[PDB]
Design a protein around this ligand. Sequence first.
Ligand SMILES: Nc1nc2c(ncn2[C@@H]2O[C@H](COP(=O)(O)OP(=O)(O)O)[C@@H](O)[C@H]2O)c(=O)[nH]1
Length: 576
Amino acid sequence: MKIRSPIVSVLGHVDHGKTTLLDHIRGSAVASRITQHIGATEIPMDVIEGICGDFLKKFSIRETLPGLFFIDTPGHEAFTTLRKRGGALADLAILIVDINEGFKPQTQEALNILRMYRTPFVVAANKIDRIHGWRVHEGRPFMETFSKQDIQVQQKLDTKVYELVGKLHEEGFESERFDRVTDFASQVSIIPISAITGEGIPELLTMLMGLAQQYLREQLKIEEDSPARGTILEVKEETGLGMTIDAVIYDGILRKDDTIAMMTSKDVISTRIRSLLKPRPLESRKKFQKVDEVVAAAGIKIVAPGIDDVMAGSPLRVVTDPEKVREEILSEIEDIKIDTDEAGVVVKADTLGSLEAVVKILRDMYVPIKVADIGDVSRRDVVNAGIALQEDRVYGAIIAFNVKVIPSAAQELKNSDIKLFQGNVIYRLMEEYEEWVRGIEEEKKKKWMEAIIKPASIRLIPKLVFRQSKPAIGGVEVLTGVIRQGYPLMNDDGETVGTVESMQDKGENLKSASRGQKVAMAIKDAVYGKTIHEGDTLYVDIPENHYHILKEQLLTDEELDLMDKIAEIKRKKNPD
Ligand SMILES: Nc1nc2c(ncn2[C@@H]2O[C@H](COP(=O)(O)OP(=O)(O)O)[C@@H](O)[C@H]2O)c(=O)[nH]1
């Protein structure tokens, strides 16, 4: 057993500086007296100590770590592909943000995933050299170069830092410029830097080491002779070689003659490795260097037969026991794909990692999942959604992340009832889904409220009697509420006097009457001069069970007052 290098991802909105930042650290390494990796950069502890001043001396873990293994983040800003059995492949992260631009959509998306997988991170407020009036002091610690700026320049920088603090706060994260942090464990540390200039990088790396000191212990233990465990980051063609796999090994050893298992779009496969390729060491004509093996804390390119359909994000396992590896990979993938008869909600994502991100977020929002898979929305996805709609329209929806819609499914989707949420920003999709369930929720109650007998009051206008009884008919004025056709009416003493049979507003047939409308009303079972009298006030005879639904669904002010009045009336022969 040994302690490996913490794996570090660099996340952030396009053009905010992820690449430039990595190149600068790479450069400080290149300029010294280092193993090369495919898709990653290892910065040895001695290099880190050379960049960080005596500032690093406060962190004892530096004496036990080999260095920091930076991931040169995947294809097209994927980042969720940097996955591992359970959560993130990265042990730590740097969230880069342009200090002059502020938080952008991609920035918030990364922030949500970092919180989701509880990955410790630091925030690098990049491009400080672009603040008006800034005088560059090449590769110097932030504190040193900052103290040489004009006072109004120092102030402009802090204004931008506090804007970031403001944004992180709205997002549920307390934070501060790194040197003003009071609780390192609960506040995000913000390090202002210039990736192009090198300014601030020393405190940036020092804070990363601070994150390691605070959080990383057993997660870094590796068994260097155990069968390698890794994650496939890319599956791509390479000139002269066929399909190739770029992977990061996070535990164990991978040898050039090993058999490795992985997941394809259909099943678990294994392949016997032909070559392990790493970049040329620092006038060979070869683009790569062959290697016999590699030990955890490595990025490698693998050449092996039928890997065309291997999924990016798939676990990579050296095989000892064929059945155990297969079931172990299947169980992992099983919690991400999903296809059952129960629940509802159909999810489609562009990659395994993204699908996993959506599935987890949904599971946190306690939304059941019927289908979750990779690929464009299909007719089958639509049909399955329709099936789930049957037991709550809350599930009659398809959440499609960075995926297109198959024409066949487009047509199937023609008939409504099936809501389609499309987008390349996970938090927005979840935002939209909630405000969607929101409406569906209101549209539901209002619907069952229409079936509830509400409070309403009526006054029998004197001298406007058109029929004494059988259908009793007379002029009426609605006092409070909304009297409806069918409503039961009761005496001032709770005695039932009849039901509203029909109403008419001048020449209009009304099923509902409100305010002080005054209409000719027919009251079934009532008889003038006997059970009802001119001038009387009549009240809706609200049922007990219906009355109780004052709390289970609450209604004008006058209506409220009336409800109490109606309660007082009926309480004359049965309290409550
Ligand atoms: N002035 C300035 N430009 C920077 C800085 N960091 C990055 N850039 C520039 O911003 C552009 C995009 O950033 P880049 O690292 O290349 O790619 P990325 O992962 O999308 O961030 C490039 O033109 C960089 O040269 C910085 O600190 N200062």
